[PDB]
Amino acid sequence: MDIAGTTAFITGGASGIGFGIAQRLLANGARLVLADIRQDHLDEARQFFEERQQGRNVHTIRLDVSDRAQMAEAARECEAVMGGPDILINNAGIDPSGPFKDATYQDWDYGLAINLMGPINGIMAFTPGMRARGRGGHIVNTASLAGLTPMPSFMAIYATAKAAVITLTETIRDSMAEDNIGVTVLMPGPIKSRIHESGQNRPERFRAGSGLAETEQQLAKRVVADNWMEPTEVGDMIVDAIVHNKLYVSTHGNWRETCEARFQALLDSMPEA
Amino acid sequence: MDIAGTTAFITGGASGIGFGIAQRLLANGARLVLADIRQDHLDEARQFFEERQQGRNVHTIRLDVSDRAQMAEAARECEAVMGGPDILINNAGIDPSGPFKDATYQDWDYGLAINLMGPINGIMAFTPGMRARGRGGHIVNTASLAGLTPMPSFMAIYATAKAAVITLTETIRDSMAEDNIGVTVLMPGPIKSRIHESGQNRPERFRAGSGLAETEQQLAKRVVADNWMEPTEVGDMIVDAIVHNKLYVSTHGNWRETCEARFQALLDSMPEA
Ligand SMILES: NC(=O)C1=CN([C@@H]2O[C@H](COP(=O)(O)OP(=O)(O)OC[C@H]3O[C@@H](n4cnc5c(N)ncnc54)[C@H](O)[C@@H]3O)[C@@H](O)[C@H]2O)C=CC1
Ligand SMILES: NC(=O)C1=CN([C@@H]2O[C@H](COP(=O)(O)OP(=O)(O)OC[C@H]3O[C@@H](n4cnc5c(N)ncnc54)[C@H](O)[C@@H]3O)[C@@H](O)[C@H]2O)C=CC1
Ligand SMILES: COc1cc([C@H](O)[C@@H](CO)Oc2ccccc2OC)ccc1O
Ligand SMILES: [Mg+2]
């Protein structure tokens, strides 16, 4: 679908990959709603586009994607202020990783709430309107290659949710197709971003009784490598996927062989038909 | 691991695949705790083993695997009444399928609660004791080939949860291995069972506001095909998986080519590293 003249609603749109996607959709003629739990991120993002005199084409909403009431309100606000959206980017996510034995129910609930229920809430809150307006659209869900290649127990909560997001995206494709809505699941490798600030981004209700505060502290000090990919490069991949209705977008090929070995082991478990 | 003398805790153990696993584990010397939400299933299972003069080695607990308090209770009751468990079979599941546009938040919450949080609750409630007792053990999670092969939107909630269970099992392997606990994900194709009674098995709190009551009513009328696999055949596959610590068990080969096509599409999305 053509991006010119559309409105895109982007969760986690005020940092990292979501912001990279925002820049590139804007550059291709979309107007933007950036939805984010971090007010300081939102302010920074707003100032960025204002410095380039694009502030008119950008709206910001502070919310938690795991709050269904806020998501319903945001769908109404998007339509009322910016129109649509035609393009739904369910991109917000956090890193709930840590020693597996230390993880508590609060950590599981947190990890699944943001990284799996966030995209589901986006679909449930926004796609009824996307269907009803009858001008098609597109959905991008940001999963991870960690949802595909074998991962260690330290990243169990993350990997589990991201694998579910890949399958979610695959399965909804034919339903969304009924109303000319395409879908893409984005599976990145290492991208420069601020996901190391995940501890700050954890919603209040998931903090008490967490077992992973110490890991979140260490994560906060992690240096962003200069050889990680730029968010705007990922943005261009998403422009391409939206224009050409591509189901899968992977940013890196470094886990091709590890994925192949996993896939082989799965096939090998199958008897002869 | 050696099955003789162990205790196996089996969710959904009073019907279908779980009951097939129950029979073959008992045949190989395990004692059983069958945990199930359906009292009539539990009573039938009880009579079956009583008629075969094995009742002393089978204890039944009525519970909902998505109730964490009940699962904590079950871990205490299992240990106190039958010992252990050494073998944890997170097998309970339901069919939340239906026209995708009809599904509501209640249907998502139901489907994920039972099919994804059920196994997680099992791991969280039972594996600390399994580590502590220091005699090793094994975990079997029942996913589905629907978590692997591409599925239509009618089965979105089911597929999404089952894909997650596969990845969950992969990721916990190294942690569990620290304490000589092996893990297996079971991925069945069509097995003779009573999963068509899923409407009856939906916990009360997920009933009001569901959009799929009509689908559940149709499902209840579905005839179990004679050429579907016997649960006891699946049971023997699981005996082998526990004895030999096999990560993957698939019961059918019918989706080899559709999985291959999916895997190839995933790999094709990856650039040259
Ligand atoms: N190496 C990487 O950066 C990779 C990132 N991903 C995924 O990319 C997505 C975007 O993350 P990044 O750009 O890397 O990090 P980021 O932290 O720079 O951007 C994420 C934004 O989402 C926001 N956010 C977090 N929780 C939220 C919530 N509950 N509600 C609303 N907004 C929330 C954050 O405040 C942040 O502004 C995530 O889903 C992440 O899992 C996947 C693969 C690789
Ligand atoms: N063709 C098949 O039968 C296939 C089954 N599966 C999976 O096999 C597993 C076992 O299901 P089946 O043996 O087929 O059906 P089943 O309905 O005969 O057995 C499942 C048992 O789990 C119980 N149960 C349901 N919800 C529960 C809950 N919240 N708490 C405690 N117990 C609960 C049921 O009462 C039932 O006795 C499920 O996870 C299912 O998704 C996967 C692929 C294929
Ligand atoms: C760069 O920050 C992170 C990035 C991820 C990503 O989802 C993925 C990158 O695709 O992490 C991995 C994926 C595949 C293999 C190894 C990965 O890192 C451990 C997870 C957690 C993070 O803190
Ligand atoms: Mg009780």
- Tell me if B62 sits within 8 A of B12, measured CB to CB: no
- CA gap A17, A91 in Å, rounded: 8
First to last CA, chain B: 40
Residue A70 CA, distance from chain mean position: 17
Question: What Å resolution does this PDB entry report?
Answer: 1.6
- CA gap B74, B71 in Å, rounded: 5
The 3-state DSSP class for residue A67 equals coil
- Ligand 3 in contact with A154 (CB < 6 A)? no
**Phi-psi map region of B25: left, alpha, beta (phi>0 left; psi -120 to 50 alpha):** alpha
Distances (CA, A) of A200 to A43, A70, A95, A216, A260: 16, 19, 11, 9, 36
- Ligand 2 in contact with B11 (CB < 6 A)? yes
- Residue B196's φ and ψ, nearest 5 degrees, are -70, -10
Ligand nearest to the CA of B35: 2
In what helix (H) or strand (E) does residue A250 lie, and over which residues does it extend? Answer: strand A248-250
Calculated CA dihedral for residues B10, B27, B78, B166, nearest 10 degrees: -30
Please report how many Cα atoms fall inside a 13 Å half-sphere around the Cα of residue A116, on the Cβ side: 30
For residue B272, list chain A residues with Cβ-Cβ distance below 8 A. Answer: 253
Q: Give the amino acid at B127.
A: T
CB within 8 Å of A27: residues ≥ 6 apart: none
- Tell me if B126 sits within 8 A of B87, measured CB to CB: no
**Between vectors from CA B162 to CA B69 and to CA B206, what angle results, nearest 5°?**
45
- Is A193 one of the annotated binding-site residues? yes
Calculated CA dihedral for residues B45, B51, B57, B61, nearest 10 degrees: 30
Distances (CA, A) of B220 to A8, B140, B191, B196, B199: 42, 27, 16, 5, 7
A42-51 contacts: CB < 8 A, separation 24 or more? Answer: A42/A14, A44/A14, A45/A13, A45/A14, A45/A15, A45/A19
In what helix (H) or strand (E) does residue B238 lie, and over which residues does it extend? Answer: helix B231-244
Q: Which atom of ligand 1 is nearest to the CA of A193?
A: 18
For residue B248, list chain A residues with Cβ-Cβ distance below 8 A. Answer: 265-266, 268-269
| Residue found under tokens 């291995």 | B177
Ligand nearest to the CA of B64: 2
Query: Pairing relation of β-strands B7-11 and B248-250?
Result: unpaired
As a residue count, chain B comes to 273
Radius of gyration of chain B (CA): 18
> Considering only CA atoms, which of A13, A148, A186 is closest in space to residue A85?
A13
- Ligand 3 in contact with A95 (CB < 6 A)? yes
CB within 8 Å of B90: residues ≥ 6 apart: B11, B65, B118, B119, B122, B123, B139, B140, B141, B142
Q: Exposure of A200 by Cβ count < 10 A (0-12 exposed, 13-18 middle, 19+ buried)?
A: middle
The 3-state DSSP class for residue A92 equals coil
A18-21 contacts: CB < 8 A, separation 24 or more? Answer: A18/A89, A18/A91, A18/A92, A18/A142, A19/A45, A19/A231, A20/A191, A20/A230, A20/A231, A20/A232, A20/A233, A20/A234, A20/A235, A21/A89, A21/A91, A21/A140, A21/A231, A21/A234, A21/A235, A21/A238
Tokens linked to A24: 């590139």
- Tell me if A134 sits within 8 A of A247, measured CB to CB: no
Q: How far is the CA of B35 from the centre of ligand 4 (A)?
A: 10
User: What's B10's DSSP letter?
Assistant: E
Query: Pairing relation of β-strands B7-11 and B31-36?
Result: parallel
In what helix (H) or strand (E) does residue A257 lie, and over which residues does it extend? Answer: helix A256-268
In terms of residue numbers, what domain contains A65?
1-273
Q: What's the domain count of chain A?
A: 1
| DSSP bridge pairs for B181 | B137
Of B253, B270, B271, the CB nearest to A273: B253
**How many Cβ atoms from other residues are within 10 Å of residue A101's Cβ?**
13
Q: How far is the CA of B44 from the centre of ligand 4 (A)?
A: 18
Calculated CA dihedral for residues B17, B20, B22, B28, nearest 10 degrees: -140
User: What's A13's DSSP letter?
Assistant: T
CATH code of the domain in which B169 resides: 3.40.50.720
For residue A111, list chain B residues with Cβ-Cβ distance below 8 A. Answer: none
